[PDB]
Amino acid sequence: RSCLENSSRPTSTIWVSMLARIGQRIVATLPYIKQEVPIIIVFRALGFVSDRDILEHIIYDFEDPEMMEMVKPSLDEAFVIQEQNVALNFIGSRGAKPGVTKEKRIKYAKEVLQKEMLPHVGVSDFCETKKAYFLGYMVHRLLLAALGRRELDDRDHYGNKRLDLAGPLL
Amino acid sequence: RAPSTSDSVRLKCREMLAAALRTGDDYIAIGADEEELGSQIEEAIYQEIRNTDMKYKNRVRSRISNLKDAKNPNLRKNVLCGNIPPDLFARMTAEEMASDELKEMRKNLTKEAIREHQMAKTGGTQTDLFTCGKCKKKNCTYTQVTTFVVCNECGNRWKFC
Amino acid sequence: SKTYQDIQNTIKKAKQDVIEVIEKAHNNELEPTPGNTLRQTFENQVNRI
Amino acid sequence: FLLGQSARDAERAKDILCRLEHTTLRKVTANTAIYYDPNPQSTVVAEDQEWVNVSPWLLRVELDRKHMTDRKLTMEQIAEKINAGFGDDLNCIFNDDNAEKLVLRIRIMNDDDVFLRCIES
Amino acid sequence: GFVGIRFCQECNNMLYPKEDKENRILLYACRNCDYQQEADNSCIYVNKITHEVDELTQIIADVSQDPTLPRTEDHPCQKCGHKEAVFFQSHSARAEDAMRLYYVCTAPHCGHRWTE
Amino acid sequence: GKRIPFGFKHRTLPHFIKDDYGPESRGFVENSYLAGLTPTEFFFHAMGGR
Amino acid sequence: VGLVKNLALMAYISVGSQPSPILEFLEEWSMENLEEISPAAIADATKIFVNGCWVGIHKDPEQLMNTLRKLRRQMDIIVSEVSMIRDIREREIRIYTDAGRICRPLLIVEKQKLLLKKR
Ligand SMILES: [Zn+2]
Ligand SMILES: [Zn+2]
């Protein structure tokens, strides 16, 4: 649940889930996007054509192949997306208000990919790097949870809760 | 004496069996006819199967591997010494042909699995002071919580307040 | 005033027994009870004690 | 409720329990590794089991021993089932019950790279 | 043994395997580029059903400086031979069935780990 | 139907140390209502009542 | 039952602060920023998160956390409501400064002796 700081827009949610079941195909539920999109297409849309860069942002160490076997399926799933334009078109095609043309869809995709998702890291003109690193950290945490190396996060743990006193409520 | 066969597959199987039986030179020490033993084994296999299909070839290969296994030459020595008749060896299974150590390990694993498959018995203080009304016996076990009565032999379940 | 002594002795004995069970589990001696895993049988033994 | 003599002794009841319990490869398999071994006799791995028995790829599905003994299985029936279930399209070269490692060798004879992944899964 | 991803040289992308039908060898081609390289591992995929993972490889030397972690003096280190040492369970989900400890030396410049 | 879980990271409460499966560290109340209760067992008893 | 709750006599909720002084104080130290950093250098390091924002990377958590604790104890640059969490198992320093973080005051115990002396 991302939220910059008492901003006009409401808090945005980013569900980076994974199919149970090829098997082990990671997806994402971006705001204002009814369907799901794989994380690899999102990374390419943020401005990362190279695969090595995407993996480095997601996975920090390459000496553990046991972790690499989990991302290979989803990585190879989206093999027909290399350039940034096609990724932007694919992400915008699933938008709530699909533009009748191609330019409108690209603009809508760039706006949702720079203002709606993860507004707390940054919503300025050039902040794609930090957004990509945060997304890679989310994927890394998801993979660690899947491997069981790190227990899940309890929902009732007050350490992950915040109280809204009269201030924020008003 | 095993009857001769004119089938090429049978002859090849007999030759392979004889060659495998010759591993380790145990035949010379025992003075047993390796060729005759191989012919008898092939004849027993052919009688059991009655066709030179894939099953017969698989059985022949398994027998050759078991007889030529360097990890348990005792089976080969016993076969060449008459301890295991050719009919028994041909009809024997993989578990029976295993070495003594392998057989002991398999038995231990099976016993451990059988024990682990069981369920823990219900705990309780067994005593003969309560007479079960469902069987007339005195053996039973009680549990205080009201004291629940559990029959030992008959299994009468009751409680006393 | 004597029942208190008996209760304290029993509690200390139970504590010693559970500590010994924990030590055995740590050093890998407590074999898994049939029908249950190692943690399950450990918890069952502790609860019974 | 057991009917035969198995009702009394647990030795003859464990087999009944096993046959009534669902057992699959995952329960008995320990490791599964695919290799693109070109020549069957080359045997990139050190295993003296293919030359005695005699496509440029195979699956080395080694099974566990403790689980197999617990369920009391034999490689003969496993090979028969794995060959009949998928028709006369593969050739499983099982291993004898004397070696330490319970290795296997699945090969296909007659897009092809992912076929082995799909079938093994 | 395991298998690691090997990126391309020019486009830096995932290299898919390929069985050369002509020379009868194993190659790794690129989906976009036409790069090729002769393989050396002769393996493509491995699955660990038992998931026999060595917990020691996950443990780090920084665990020693933990104020909420037990310490014992009866299990000294091996290399340096210090007395103080910590101990804890796997602390990893999906624990099959084992509370086996993983002793870690409590001293700077050592970071040794062992098990008994 | 089980003992007190590990709400924190591998421990019931901050007082007890990690991997402390002892009786008093998992809910076993050693004292009695006449002789008072320890705060930790007091909290665990409150959990049971809830 | 169980949904309605009441605060404790000592329980106190953080009113909220700003992250700018903390960012400046962590930026002065030898902390490489996340925008310009070798990806291979993330493994043997600790990731710093402030208000859930991943920024900067450090190479000495055992000293950084001590410096932060001393600074908060002196009440000069960081208010008493801020909280620095130290994750030992995985190297991550997640700091939070937003409001709603319920907390309470606790005495400090350096080795085996408190600081609340007779003075
Ligand atoms: Zn390439
Ligand atoms: Zn040391």
Structural domain boundaries in chain E: 3-47, 48-116
Angle between helices C38-48 and C3-26 (to 10 degrees): 170
Kindly give the pairing relationship between strand D29-35 and strand E71-72.
unpaired
Q: Which residue has the tokens 């192949």?
A: A65
Q: Which residues of C are less than 8 Å from B118 in CB distance?
A: 34-35
Residues 6+ apart with CB under 8 A from B21: B27, B34, B37, B38, B67, B76, B79, B80
Contact indicator for B140, B127 with CB cutoff of 8 Å: yes
Contact indicator for E64, E105 with CB cutoff of 8 Å: yes
Contact indicator for A113, A46 with CB cutoff of 8 Å: yes
**Encoding tokens for residue G83?**
């909280």
- The 10 Å CB-count burial string (b at 16+, else e) for B62-95 is bbbbbbbbeebbebbbebbeeebebeebbebebe
Contact indicator for E112, E59 with CB cutoff of 8 Å: no
Contact indicator for D120, D59 with CB cutoff of 8 Å: yes
Residues 6+ apart with CB under 8 A from B129: B138
**Encoding tokens for residue G56?**
């900067």
Q: Where are the alpha helices (DSSP H) in chain A?
A: 39-45, 51-58, 65-77, 84-93, 102-111, 128-147, 166-169
Between the alpha carbon of residue E53 and those of residues B111, E44, F9, G104, the distances in Å are: 28, 20, 22, 41
Q: What is the CATH number of the domain that holds D11?
A: 3.30.1360.140
Subunit contact D96:B109, Cβ cutoff 8 A: no
**Encoding tokens for residue E37?**
């390289």
Measured CB to CB, residues of chain B less than 8 Å from chain C are 115-120, 123
β-sheet with G92-96: strand ranges across? G53-58, G46-50, G92-96, G83-87
User: φ and ψ at B7, to 5 degrees?
Assistant: -75, 135
The span from the CA of B151 to the CA of B142, in Å, is 8
The span from the CA of F2 to the CA of B127, in Å, is 30
Strand partners, B157: B150
Contact indicator for C42, C32 with CB cutoff of 8 Å: no
Nearest residue, CB atoms, D76 vs list B94, B112, B116: B94
Give the residue from D59, D41, D58 showing the smallest Cα distance to D50.
Answer: D41
User: What's at G11, amino acid-wise?
Assistant: A
User: What's at G39, amino acid-wise?
Assistant: P
Q: Ligand 2 centroid vs E105 CA: distance in angstroms?
A: 5
Q: Which residues of E are less than 8 Å from G89 in CB distance?
A: 60, 63, 91
- Domains in chain D, number: 1
Chain B: give the shortest CA distance to residue C21, in Å. 18
Contact indicator for D60, D35 with CB cutoff of 8 Å: yes
What is the number of other CB atoms lying within 10 angstroms of the CB of residue F3? 16
The span from the CA of E13 to the CA of E7, in Å, is 5
Give the residue from D51, D47, D52 showing the smallest Cα distance to D62.
Answer: D47
The span from the CA of D16 to the CA of D10, in Å, is 10
Question: Is D36 annotated as contributing to ligand binding?
Answer: yes
DSSP strand E in chain D: where?
Answer: 29-35, 58-63, 90-92, 106-108
The span from the CA of E71 to the CA of E104, in Å, is 9
The count of C-alpha atoms lying within 13 angstroms of the C-alpha of C11, restricted to the half-sphere facing its C-beta, is 13
The span from the CA of E36 to the CA of E17, in Å, is 10
Peptide-bond breaks in chain G following residues (C–N over 2.5 A): none
Contact indicator for C8, B89 with CB cutoff of 8 Å: no
H and E: helices and strands count for chain G: 2, 6
Chain B: give the shortest CA distance to residue C43, in Å. 14
Annotated binding site of E for Zn(2+): 8, 11, 30, 33, 77, 80, 105, 110
Element (H, E) at B147: strand B147-151
Chain E: give the shortest CA distance to residue C47, in Å. 18
Does a structural domain hold residue D51? yes
User: What's at D84, amino acid-wise?
Assistant: A
Residue C34 contacts E where some CB pair is shorter than 8 Å = no
The nearest alpha carbon in chain C to F28 belongs to: C47
Does a structural domain hold residue D1? no
Contact indicator for B2, B39 with CB cutoff of 8 Å: yes
C: neighbours with 3+ CB pairs under 8 Å? B, E, F
Give the residue from G49, D47, B32 showing the smallest Cα distance to A138.
Answer: G49
The span from the CA of G24 to the CA of B117, in Å, is 63
Print the domain residue range for D116: 6-121
Subunit contact C39:E116, Cβ cutoff 8 A: no
The count of C-alpha atoms lying within 13 angstroms of the C-alpha of E43, restricted to the half-sphere facing its C-beta, is 15
- The backbone region for E109, taken as left when phi is positive above 0, alpha when psi lies in -120 to 50, beta otherwise, is left
Q: Which fold has domain E48-116?
A: N-terminal domain of TfIIb (2.20.25)
Between the alpha carbon of residue D72 and those of residues A147, C24, C37, D17, G95, the distances in Å are: 31, 31, 21, 11, 56
Which experimental approach was used here?
cryo-EM
Residues 6+ apart with CB under 8 A from A32: A95, A96, A112, A116
Subunit contact E89:F17, Cβ cutoff 8 A: no
Q: Sign (positive/negative) of CA torsion B75, B79, B81, B87?
A: positive
Residues 6+ apart with CB under 8 A from D75: B94, D63, D94, D95, D97, D102, D104
Q: Rounded to an integer, what is the distance from CA B39 to the centroid of its chain? A: 26
Contact indicator for E105, E112 with CB cutoff of 8 Å: yes
CA dihedral A32, A38, A42, A45 (to 10 degrees): -110
Subunit contact E93:A65, Cβ cutoff 8 A: no
Chain E: give the shortest CA distance to residue F21, in Å. 11
- The backbone region for A47, taken as left when phi is positive above 0, alpha when psi lies in -120 to 50, beta otherwise, is left
Does a structural domain hold residue D32? yes
